[PDB]
Short mmCIF file of C-alpha atoms and ligand atoms in Angstrom, two decimals:
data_model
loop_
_atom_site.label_atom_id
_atom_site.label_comp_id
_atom_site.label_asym_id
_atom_site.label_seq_id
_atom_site.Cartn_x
_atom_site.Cartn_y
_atom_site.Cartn_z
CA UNK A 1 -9.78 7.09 -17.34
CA UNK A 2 -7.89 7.37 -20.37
CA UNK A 3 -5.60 4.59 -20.52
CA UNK A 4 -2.27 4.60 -22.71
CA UNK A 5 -0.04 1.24 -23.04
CA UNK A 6 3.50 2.66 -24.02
CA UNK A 7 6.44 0.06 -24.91
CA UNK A 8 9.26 -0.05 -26.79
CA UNK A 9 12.57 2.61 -26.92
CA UNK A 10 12.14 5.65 -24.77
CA UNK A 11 10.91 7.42 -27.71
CA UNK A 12 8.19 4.98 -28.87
CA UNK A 13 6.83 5.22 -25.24
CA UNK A 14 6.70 9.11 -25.72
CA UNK A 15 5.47 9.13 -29.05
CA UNK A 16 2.59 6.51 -27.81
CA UNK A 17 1.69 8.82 -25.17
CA UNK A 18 2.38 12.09 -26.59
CA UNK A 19 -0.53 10.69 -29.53
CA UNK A 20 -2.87 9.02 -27.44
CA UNK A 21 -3.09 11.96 -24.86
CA UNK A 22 -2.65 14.57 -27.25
CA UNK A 23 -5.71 16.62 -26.47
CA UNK A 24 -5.23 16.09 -23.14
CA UNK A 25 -1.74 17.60 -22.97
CA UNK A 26 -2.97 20.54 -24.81
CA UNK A 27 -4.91 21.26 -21.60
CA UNK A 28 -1.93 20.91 -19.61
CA UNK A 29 0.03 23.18 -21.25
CA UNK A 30 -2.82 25.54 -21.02
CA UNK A 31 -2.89 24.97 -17.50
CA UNK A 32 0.69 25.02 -17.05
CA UNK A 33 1.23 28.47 -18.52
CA UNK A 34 -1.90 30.27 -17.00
CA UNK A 35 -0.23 29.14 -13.81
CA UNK A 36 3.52 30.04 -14.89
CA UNK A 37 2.91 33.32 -15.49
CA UNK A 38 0.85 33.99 -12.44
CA UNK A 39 3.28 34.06 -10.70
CA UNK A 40 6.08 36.36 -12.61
CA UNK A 41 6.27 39.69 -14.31
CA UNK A 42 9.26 38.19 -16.81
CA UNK A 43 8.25 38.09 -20.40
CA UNK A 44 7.44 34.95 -22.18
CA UNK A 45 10.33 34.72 -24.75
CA UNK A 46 12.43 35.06 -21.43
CA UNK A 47 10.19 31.94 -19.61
CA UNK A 48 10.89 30.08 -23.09
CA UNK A 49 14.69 30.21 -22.46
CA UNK A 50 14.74 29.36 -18.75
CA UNK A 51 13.22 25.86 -20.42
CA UNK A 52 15.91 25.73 -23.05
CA UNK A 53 18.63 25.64 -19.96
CA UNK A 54 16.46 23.05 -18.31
CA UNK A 55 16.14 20.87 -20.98
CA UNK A 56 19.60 20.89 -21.75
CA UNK A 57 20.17 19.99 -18.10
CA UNK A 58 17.50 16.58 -18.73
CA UNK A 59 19.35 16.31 -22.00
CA UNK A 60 22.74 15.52 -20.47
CA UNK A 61 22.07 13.79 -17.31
CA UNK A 62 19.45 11.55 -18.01
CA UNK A 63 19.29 10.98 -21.55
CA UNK A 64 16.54 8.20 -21.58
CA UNK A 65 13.96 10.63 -19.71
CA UNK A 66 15.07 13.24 -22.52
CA UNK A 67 14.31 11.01 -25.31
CA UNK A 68 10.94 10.06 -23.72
CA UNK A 69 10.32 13.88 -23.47
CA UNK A 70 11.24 14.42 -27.00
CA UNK A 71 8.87 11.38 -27.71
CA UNK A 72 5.73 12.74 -26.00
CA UNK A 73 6.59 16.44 -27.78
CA UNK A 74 6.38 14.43 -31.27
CA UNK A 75 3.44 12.85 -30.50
CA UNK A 76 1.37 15.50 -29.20
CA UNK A 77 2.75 17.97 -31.93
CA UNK A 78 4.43 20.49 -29.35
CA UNK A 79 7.52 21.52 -28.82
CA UNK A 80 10.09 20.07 -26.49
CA UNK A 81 10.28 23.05 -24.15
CA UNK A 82 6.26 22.96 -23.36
CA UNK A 83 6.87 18.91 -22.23
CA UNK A 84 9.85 19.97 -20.19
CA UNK A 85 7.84 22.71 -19.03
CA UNK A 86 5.31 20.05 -17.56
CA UNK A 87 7.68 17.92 -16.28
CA UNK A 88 9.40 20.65 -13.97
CA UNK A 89 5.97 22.80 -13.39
CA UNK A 90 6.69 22.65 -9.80
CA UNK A 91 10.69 23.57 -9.94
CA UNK A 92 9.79 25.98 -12.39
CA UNK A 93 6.92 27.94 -10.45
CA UNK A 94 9.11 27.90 -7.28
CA UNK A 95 11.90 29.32 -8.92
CA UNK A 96 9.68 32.25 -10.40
CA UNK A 97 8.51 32.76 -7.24
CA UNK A 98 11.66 32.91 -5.78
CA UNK A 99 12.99 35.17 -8.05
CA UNK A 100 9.20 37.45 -8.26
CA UNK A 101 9.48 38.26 -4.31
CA UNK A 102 -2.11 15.67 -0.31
CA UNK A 103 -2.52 13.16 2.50
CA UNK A 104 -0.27 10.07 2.43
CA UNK A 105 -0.57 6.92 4.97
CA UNK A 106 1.41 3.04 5.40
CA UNK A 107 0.44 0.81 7.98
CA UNK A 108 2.38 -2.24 8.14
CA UNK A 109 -0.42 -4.80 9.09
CA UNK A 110 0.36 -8.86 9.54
CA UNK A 111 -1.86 -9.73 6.71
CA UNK A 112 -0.94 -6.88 4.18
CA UNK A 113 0.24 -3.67 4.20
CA UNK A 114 -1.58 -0.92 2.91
CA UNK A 115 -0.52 2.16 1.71
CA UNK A 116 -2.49 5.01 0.16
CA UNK A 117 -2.46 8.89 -0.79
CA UNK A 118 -5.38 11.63 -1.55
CA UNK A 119 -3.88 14.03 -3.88
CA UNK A 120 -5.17 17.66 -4.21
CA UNK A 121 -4.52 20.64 -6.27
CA UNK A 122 -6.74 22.94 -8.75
CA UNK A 123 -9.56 20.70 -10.03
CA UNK A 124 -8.76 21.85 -13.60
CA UNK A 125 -6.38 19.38 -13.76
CA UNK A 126 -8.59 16.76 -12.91
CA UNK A 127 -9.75 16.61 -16.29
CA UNK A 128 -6.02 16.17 -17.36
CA UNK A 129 -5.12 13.13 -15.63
CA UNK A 130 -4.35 10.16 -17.61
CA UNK A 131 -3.19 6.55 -16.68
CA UNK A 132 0.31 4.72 -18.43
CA UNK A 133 1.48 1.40 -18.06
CA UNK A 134 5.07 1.45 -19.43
CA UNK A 135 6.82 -1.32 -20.31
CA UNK A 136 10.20 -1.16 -20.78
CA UNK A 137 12.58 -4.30 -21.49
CA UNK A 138 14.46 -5.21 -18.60
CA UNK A 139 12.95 -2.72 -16.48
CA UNK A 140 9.87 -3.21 -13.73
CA UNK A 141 6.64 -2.60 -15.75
CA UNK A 142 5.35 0.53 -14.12
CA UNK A 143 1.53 1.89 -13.79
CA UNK A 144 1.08 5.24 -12.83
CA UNK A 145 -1.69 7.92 -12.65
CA UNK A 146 -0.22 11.07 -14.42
CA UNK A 147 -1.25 14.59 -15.39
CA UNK A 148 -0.70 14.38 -19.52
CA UNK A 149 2.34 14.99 -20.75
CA UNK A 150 4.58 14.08 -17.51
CA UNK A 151 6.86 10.84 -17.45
CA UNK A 152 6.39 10.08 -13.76
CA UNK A 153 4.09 10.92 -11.34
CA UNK A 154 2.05 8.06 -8.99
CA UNK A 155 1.62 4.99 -8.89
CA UNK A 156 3.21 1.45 -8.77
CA UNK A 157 5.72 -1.23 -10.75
CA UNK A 158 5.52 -5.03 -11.61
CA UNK A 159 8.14 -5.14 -8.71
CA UNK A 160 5.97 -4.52 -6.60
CA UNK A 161 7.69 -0.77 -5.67
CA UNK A 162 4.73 1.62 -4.42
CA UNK A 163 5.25 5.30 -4.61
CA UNK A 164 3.26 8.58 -3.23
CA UNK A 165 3.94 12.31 -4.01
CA UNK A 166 2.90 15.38 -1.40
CA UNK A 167 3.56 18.77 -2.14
CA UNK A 168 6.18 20.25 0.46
CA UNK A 169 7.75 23.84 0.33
CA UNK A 170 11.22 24.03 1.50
CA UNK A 171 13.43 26.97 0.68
CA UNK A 172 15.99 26.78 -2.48
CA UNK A 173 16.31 25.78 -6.01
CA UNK A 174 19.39 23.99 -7.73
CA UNK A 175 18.62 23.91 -11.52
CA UNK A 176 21.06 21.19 -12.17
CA UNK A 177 19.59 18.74 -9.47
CA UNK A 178 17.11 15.91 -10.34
CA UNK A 179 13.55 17.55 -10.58
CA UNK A 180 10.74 15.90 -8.47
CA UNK A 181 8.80 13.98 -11.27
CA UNK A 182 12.15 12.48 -12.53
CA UNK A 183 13.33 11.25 -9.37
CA UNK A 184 9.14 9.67 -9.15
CA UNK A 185 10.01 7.91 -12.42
CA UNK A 186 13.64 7.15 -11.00
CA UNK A 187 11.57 5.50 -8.26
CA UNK A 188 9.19 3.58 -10.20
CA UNK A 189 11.73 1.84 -12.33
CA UNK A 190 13.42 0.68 -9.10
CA UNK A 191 13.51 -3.53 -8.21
CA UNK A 192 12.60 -2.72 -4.29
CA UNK A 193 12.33 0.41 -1.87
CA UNK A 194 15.74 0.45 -0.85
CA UNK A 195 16.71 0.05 -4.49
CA UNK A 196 14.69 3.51 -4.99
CA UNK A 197 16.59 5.41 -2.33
CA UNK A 198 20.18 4.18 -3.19
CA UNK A 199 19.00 5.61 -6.78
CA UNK A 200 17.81 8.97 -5.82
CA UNK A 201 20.64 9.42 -3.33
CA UNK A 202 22.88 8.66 -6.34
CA UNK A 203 21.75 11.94 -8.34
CA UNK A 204 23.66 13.85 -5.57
CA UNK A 205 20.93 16.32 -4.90
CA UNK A 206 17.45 17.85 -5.19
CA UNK A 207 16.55 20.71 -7.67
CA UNK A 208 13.83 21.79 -5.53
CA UNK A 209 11.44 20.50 -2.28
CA UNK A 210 8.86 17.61 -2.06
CA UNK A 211 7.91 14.99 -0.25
CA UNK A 212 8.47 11.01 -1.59
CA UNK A 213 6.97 7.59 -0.15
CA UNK A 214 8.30 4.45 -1.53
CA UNK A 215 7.02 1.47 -0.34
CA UNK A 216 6.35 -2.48 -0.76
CA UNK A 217 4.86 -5.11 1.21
CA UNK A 218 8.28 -5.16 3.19
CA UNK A 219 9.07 -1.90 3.87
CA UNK A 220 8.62 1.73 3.50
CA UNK A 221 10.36 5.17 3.83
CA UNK A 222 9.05 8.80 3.32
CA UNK A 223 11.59 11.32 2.11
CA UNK A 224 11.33 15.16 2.81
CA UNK A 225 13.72 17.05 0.58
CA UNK A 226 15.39 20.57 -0.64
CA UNK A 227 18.65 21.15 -2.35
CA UNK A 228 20.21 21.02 1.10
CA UNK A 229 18.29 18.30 2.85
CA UNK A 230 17.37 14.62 2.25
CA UNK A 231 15.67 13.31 5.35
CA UNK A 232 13.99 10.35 5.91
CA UNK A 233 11.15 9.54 7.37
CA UNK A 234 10.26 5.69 8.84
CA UNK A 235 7.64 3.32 10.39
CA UNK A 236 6.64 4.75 13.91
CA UNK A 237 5.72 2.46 16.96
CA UNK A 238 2.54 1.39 15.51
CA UNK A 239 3.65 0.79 11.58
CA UNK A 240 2.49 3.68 10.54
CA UNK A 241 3.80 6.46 8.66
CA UNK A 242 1.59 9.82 7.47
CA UNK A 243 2.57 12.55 5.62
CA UNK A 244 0.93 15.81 5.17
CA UNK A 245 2.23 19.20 3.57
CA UNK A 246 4.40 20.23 6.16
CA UNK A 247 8.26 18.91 7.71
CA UNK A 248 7.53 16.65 10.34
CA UNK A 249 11.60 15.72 10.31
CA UNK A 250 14.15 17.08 12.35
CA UNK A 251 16.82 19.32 9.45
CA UNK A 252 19.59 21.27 9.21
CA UNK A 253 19.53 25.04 11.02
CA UNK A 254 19.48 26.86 7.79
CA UNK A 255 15.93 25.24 6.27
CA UNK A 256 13.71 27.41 6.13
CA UNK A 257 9.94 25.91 5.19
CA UNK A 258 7.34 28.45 3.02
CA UNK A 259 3.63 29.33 3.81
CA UNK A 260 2.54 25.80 4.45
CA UNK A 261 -1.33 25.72 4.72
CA UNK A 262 -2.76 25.58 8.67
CA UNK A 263 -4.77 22.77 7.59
CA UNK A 264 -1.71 20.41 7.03
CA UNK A 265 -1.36 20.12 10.81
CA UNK A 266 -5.05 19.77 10.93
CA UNK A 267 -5.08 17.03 8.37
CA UNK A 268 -2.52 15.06 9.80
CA UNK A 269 -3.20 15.24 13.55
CA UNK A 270 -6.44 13.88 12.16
CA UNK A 271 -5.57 11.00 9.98
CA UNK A 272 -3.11 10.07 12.95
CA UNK A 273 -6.36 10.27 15.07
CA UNK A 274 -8.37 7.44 12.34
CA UNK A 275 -5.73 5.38 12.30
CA UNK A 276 -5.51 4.66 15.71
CA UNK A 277 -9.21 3.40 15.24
CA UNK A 278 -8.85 1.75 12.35
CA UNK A 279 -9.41 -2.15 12.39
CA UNK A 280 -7.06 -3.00 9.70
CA UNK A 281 -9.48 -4.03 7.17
CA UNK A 282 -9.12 -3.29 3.65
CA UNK A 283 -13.10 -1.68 3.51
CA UNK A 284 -11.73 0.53 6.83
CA UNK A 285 -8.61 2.02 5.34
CA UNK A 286 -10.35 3.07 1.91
CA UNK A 287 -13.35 4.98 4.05
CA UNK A 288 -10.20 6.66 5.95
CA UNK A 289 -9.77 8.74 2.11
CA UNK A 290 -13.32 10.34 2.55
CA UNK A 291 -13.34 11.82 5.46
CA UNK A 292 -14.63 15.61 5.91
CA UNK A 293 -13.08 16.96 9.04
CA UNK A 294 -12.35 20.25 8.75
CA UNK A 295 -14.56 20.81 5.77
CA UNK A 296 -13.37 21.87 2.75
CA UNK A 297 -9.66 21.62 4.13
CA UNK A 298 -10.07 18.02 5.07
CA UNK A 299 -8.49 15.01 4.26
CA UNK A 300 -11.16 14.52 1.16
CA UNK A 301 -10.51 18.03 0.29
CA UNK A 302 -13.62 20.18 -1.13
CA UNK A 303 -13.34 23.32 -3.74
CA UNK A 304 -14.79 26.21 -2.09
CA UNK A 305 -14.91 29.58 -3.93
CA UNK A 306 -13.22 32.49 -1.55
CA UNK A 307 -12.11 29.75 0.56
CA UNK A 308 -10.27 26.16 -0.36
CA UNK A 309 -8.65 26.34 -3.96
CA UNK A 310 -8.36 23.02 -4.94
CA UNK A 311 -10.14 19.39 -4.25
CA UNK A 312 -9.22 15.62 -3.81
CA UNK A 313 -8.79 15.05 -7.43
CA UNK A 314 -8.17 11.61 -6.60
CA UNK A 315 -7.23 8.47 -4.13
CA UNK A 316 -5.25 5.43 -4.83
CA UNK A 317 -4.58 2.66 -2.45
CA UNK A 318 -2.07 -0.21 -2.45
CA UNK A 319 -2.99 -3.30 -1.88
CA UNK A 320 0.66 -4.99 -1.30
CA UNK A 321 -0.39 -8.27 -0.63
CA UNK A 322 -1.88 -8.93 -3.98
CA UNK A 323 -0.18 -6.27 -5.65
CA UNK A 324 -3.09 -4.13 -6.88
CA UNK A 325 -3.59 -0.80 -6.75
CA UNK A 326 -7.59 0.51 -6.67
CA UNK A 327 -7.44 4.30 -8.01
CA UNK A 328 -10.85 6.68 -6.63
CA UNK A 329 -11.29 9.29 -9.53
CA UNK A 330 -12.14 12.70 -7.59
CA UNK A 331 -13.36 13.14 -3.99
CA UNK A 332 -13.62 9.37 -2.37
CA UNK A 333 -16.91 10.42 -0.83
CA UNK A 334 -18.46 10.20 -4.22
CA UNK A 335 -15.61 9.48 -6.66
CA UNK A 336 -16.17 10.04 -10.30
CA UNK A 337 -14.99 6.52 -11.63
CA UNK A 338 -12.80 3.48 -9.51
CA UNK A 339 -11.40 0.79 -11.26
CA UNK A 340 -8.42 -1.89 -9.86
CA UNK A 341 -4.83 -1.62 -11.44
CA UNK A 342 -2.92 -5.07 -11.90
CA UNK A 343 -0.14 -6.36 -13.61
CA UNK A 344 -0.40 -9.23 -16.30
CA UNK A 345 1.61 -12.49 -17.30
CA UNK A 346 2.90 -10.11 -20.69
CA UNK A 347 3.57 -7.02 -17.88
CA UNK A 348 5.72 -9.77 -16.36
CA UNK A 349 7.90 -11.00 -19.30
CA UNK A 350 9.01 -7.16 -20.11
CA UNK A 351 10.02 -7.07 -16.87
CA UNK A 352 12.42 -10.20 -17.09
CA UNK A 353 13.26 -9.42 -20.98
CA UNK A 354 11.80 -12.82 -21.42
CL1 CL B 1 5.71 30.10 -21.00
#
C-alpha cells in the first residue's frame, strides 16, 4: 500500500502527504462529494461555506491539525475546504442529514494482548487508503492506515498506544466540538491509554457520535460518544472487550441512537461467541477477522448488489507484546496484500527529540 514518511513542522508533514498521495486524494474528494450531496438538497456554494465555518473552528482550536490540513491542501493542489471536508466527512454527512429530514475486539491474554478491528464501508474507498508514519519531534511516532487526505484515522504510535474506529450513530451535532478523526489523531499522539482519554476528555465535548478503542499491552478502554455522552466501555470478566455498530453502554435518558444495521447485534453476539473458543494464539485470533456468518453482513463483510453496501476493506491486528501491527488489505478471507508495521531505532529518536 502506498506508503508516505511525513516529518518535520505540521506543514511539511501535510505537504509530504498532500504530494505523495495526491492522486489518491483526488479520489477522495470525488468520493467525498458524490456522498455529500446524496444526502442534501442545499446547493453547493452553500456546502462550500458550511466548510469555511468548520475550518475556522480547526483553525482556532487546534492550530497544529490546521496547519497540517493546510499542508496536505498545498501538496495535493486543492483547496483547504475540500481537506477539511475529508477530515469531518462523517460530522458533515450527519449534520446534512440532520438538517435534510466495523468489528473491534481486545483480549487481555498472559502472554500478549491482542487487539484488532475489521473496518467496512463502500469499497470505493478501498482504493483510497494510504499508510503514514509521522514523525513528529517530541511526539510518539505514529503509523496509521488512512483514507488520503485525513490526518488521523487507525492505527498505532512508537508508544506503544493502539487505537480502533467503529462507526456509531447517536443523535446530535455540536459544530464547535472536536470531530472524530481529530480526537483519533489526538489519540495517537498520546504517551499511554489513559494519557489518550485525559486528552479527549480535555476538548470538553464531541461534535458528533463514534465509537473509540485505545489500547496497549496494559490496558484498554472503548469509548461510545455524542455531544451529550462520553461513556466508557472496559475489560469484561474474561478480558475481553468487542465493539460493534451499536450502544452496548448504559446513557443518559435523552440519547437517542439512529437506524443501526440488524446485523450489528448479529456480528457481535457472534464474535462474542469465537472468542469464547478461541485458544489465545496469535494464528487463532487473525482467522477470527474472516469469518462469514451471516453472509454478506458478517464479521468479514461481503459487497452484495441489492443487498450489503459495503465490504471489509481491511483488518489490522495488534500485536502488543512486540509492538507490531500486521494490516490485511480487503476481506481477510482472501486479503489483497498483508504486510507487518514496526517501529525503527530513527522512529525512536523522534520520539525522544534525541
Ligand atoms: Cl461540496
Amino acid at each position: 500500500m502506498l506508503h508516505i514518511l511525513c516529518q518535520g513542522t505540521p506543514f511539511e508533514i501535510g505537504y509530504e502527504h498532500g504530494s505523495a498521495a495526491k492522486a489518491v486524494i483526488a479520489r477522495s474528494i470525488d468520493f467525498a462529494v458524490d456522498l455529500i450531496r446524496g444526502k442534501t438538497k442545499k446547493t453547493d456554494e452553500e456546502l462550500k461555506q458550511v466548510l469555511s465555518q468548520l475550518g475556522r473552528v480547526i483553525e482556532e482550536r487546534w492550530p497544529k491539525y490546521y496547519e497540517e490540513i493546510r499542508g496536505i491542501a498545498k501538496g495535493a493542489e486543492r483547496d483547504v475546504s475540500e481537506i477539511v471536508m475529508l477530515n469531518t466527512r462523517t460530522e458533515f454527512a450527519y449534520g446534512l442529514k440532520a438538517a435534510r429530514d466495523c468489528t473491534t475486539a481486545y483480549c487481555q491474554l498472559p502472554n500478549g494482548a491482542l487487539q484488532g478491528q475489521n473496518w467496512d464501508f463502500f469499497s470505493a474507498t478501498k482504493e483510497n487508503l494510504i499508510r503514514l508514519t509521522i514523525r513528529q519531534a517530541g511526539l510518539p511516532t505514529i503509523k496509521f492506515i488512512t483514507e488520503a487526505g485525513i490526518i488521523g484515522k487507525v492505527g498505532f504510535n512508537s508508544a506503544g498506544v493502539a487505537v480502533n474506529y467503529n462507526a456509531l450513530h447517536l443523535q446530535g451535532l455540536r459544530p464547535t466540538g472536536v470531530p472524530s478523526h481529530i480526537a483519533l489523531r489526538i489519540a495517537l499522539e498520546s504517551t499511554s491509554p489513559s494519557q489518550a482519554y485525559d486528552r479527549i476528555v480535555e476538548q470538553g465535548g464531541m461534535a458528533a457520535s463514534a465509537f473509540i478503542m485505545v489500547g496497549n499491552g496494559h490496558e484498554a478502554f472503548g469509548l461510545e460518544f455524542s455531544p451529550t455522552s462520553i461513556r466508557k466501555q472496559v475489560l469484561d470478566a474474561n478480558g475481553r472487550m468487542v465493539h460493534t455498530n451499536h450502544c452496548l453502554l448504559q446513557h443518559g435518558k435523552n440519547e437517542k441512537e439512529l437506524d443501526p444495521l440488524p446485523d450489528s447485534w448479529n456480528r457481535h453476539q457472534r464474535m462474542e461467541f469465537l472468542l469464547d473458543g478461541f485458544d489465545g494464539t496469535k494464528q487463532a485470533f487473525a482467522q477470527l477477522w474472516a469469518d462469514e456468518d451471516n453472509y454478506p453482513f458478517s464479521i468479514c463483510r461481503a459487497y452484495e448488489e441489492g443487498k450489503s453496501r459495503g465490504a471489509t476493506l481491511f483488518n489490522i491486528i495488534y500485536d502488543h507484546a512486540r509492538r507490531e501491527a500486521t494490516v490485511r488489505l480487503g476481506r481477510p478471507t482472501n486479503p489483497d496484500e498483508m504486510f507487518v508495521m514496526r517501529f525503527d531505532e530513527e522512529d525512536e529518536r523522534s520520539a525522544l527529540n534525541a
